[PDB]
């Protein structure tokens, strides 16, 4: 019932190989819907979901204008960060930004976000009040001082409670067929002998959307957290996701083990066992 919109920007410097590359992607929940890349032959905000294609020229031109402006800002921020951290002009560095809004079933703002990182470490973040900042270090405290002077948080707050929520609501309605459809996991248990003494039981979940899922093994009804091998949830490439959880069990003790699956697409959590 709850939904989110998030934009992710990455600016990467590459001394001696031109100006820094700027790439932006937009998502609603786990569905990418737009992309911008400064390295494209003709850089433009481009559609990546069928439900955004209906947006007119005014949308695409406006989004492209904002992206080219953001690429210019972040190339300047990469030069500013070199100064704040006393770094040479010889190395490659990265700025990352993630921002957006979360809404509940009624479409009202649950929370806003605006966070930045330099070289993969937190730099500055807008606090949950949408009025104050958390700076990670003394360099980010310089940016915090500049942004408090320019009342940047008020501008972000207006966007997050305004245009962000309004456009997320629009995308959810335009893409309701897919954005508002949960696909439950297709589940099964496989058994692979290791030796005469042990076997692997692997619990699979396939074809599910959204990505959030819980896959756990229990032995005699007790969670096997330390003994379970869990792979990271992975995209199948057709919008859906996959995951598996495995446990090594003694031969003949297979029926003591149960796999539990929780997913928003499931009315009730599922219990699975190996079926020989």
């Amino acid at each position: 019932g709850s939904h989110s919109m998030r934009y992710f920007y990455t600016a990467m410097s590459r001394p001696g190989r031109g100006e820094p590359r700027f790439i932006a992607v937009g998502y609603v929940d786990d569905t990418q819907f737009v992309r911008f890349d400064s390295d494209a032959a003709s850089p433009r905000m481009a559609p990546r979901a069928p439900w955004i294609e209906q947006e007119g020229p005014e949308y695409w031109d406006g989004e492209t204008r904002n992206m080219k402006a953001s690429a210019q800002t972040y190339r300047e921020n990469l030069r500013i960060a070199l100064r704040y951290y006393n770094q040479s002009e010889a190395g490659s560095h990265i700025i990352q930004v993630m921002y957006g809004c979360d809404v509940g079933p009624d479409g009202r703002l649950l929370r806003g976000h605006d966070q930045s990182a330099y070289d993969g470490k937190d730099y500055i973040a807008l606090n949950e009040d949408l009025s104050s900042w958390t700076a990670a270090d003394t360099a980010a405290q310089i940016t915090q001082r500049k942004w408090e002077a320019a009342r940047v948080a008020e501008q972000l707050r207006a966007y997050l409670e305004g245009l962000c929520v309004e456009w997320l609501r629009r995308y959810l309605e335009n893409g309701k067929e897919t954005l508002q459809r949960a696909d439950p996991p297709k589940t099964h248990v496989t058994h692979h002998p290791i030796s005469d003494h042990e076997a692997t039981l692997r619990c699979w979940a396939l074809g599910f959307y959204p990505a959030e899922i819980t896959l756990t093994w229990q032995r005699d009804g007790e969670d096997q957290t330390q003994d379970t091998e869990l792979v990271e949830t992975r995209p199948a490439g057709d919008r859906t996701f996959q995951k598996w959880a495995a446990v090594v069990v003694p031969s003949g003790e297979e029926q003591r083990y149960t796999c539990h699956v929780q997913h928003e697409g499931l009315p009730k959590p599922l219990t699975l066992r190996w079926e020989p």
């Binding site: 937009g26 500013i80 704040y84 940016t143 942004w147 320019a150 501008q155 456009w167």
Partner: peptide, 8 residues
């Protein structure tokens, strides 16, 4: 829609 510039 993206945020409609604030240097570090």
């Amino acid at each position: 829609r993206v945020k409609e510039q604030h240097l570090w």
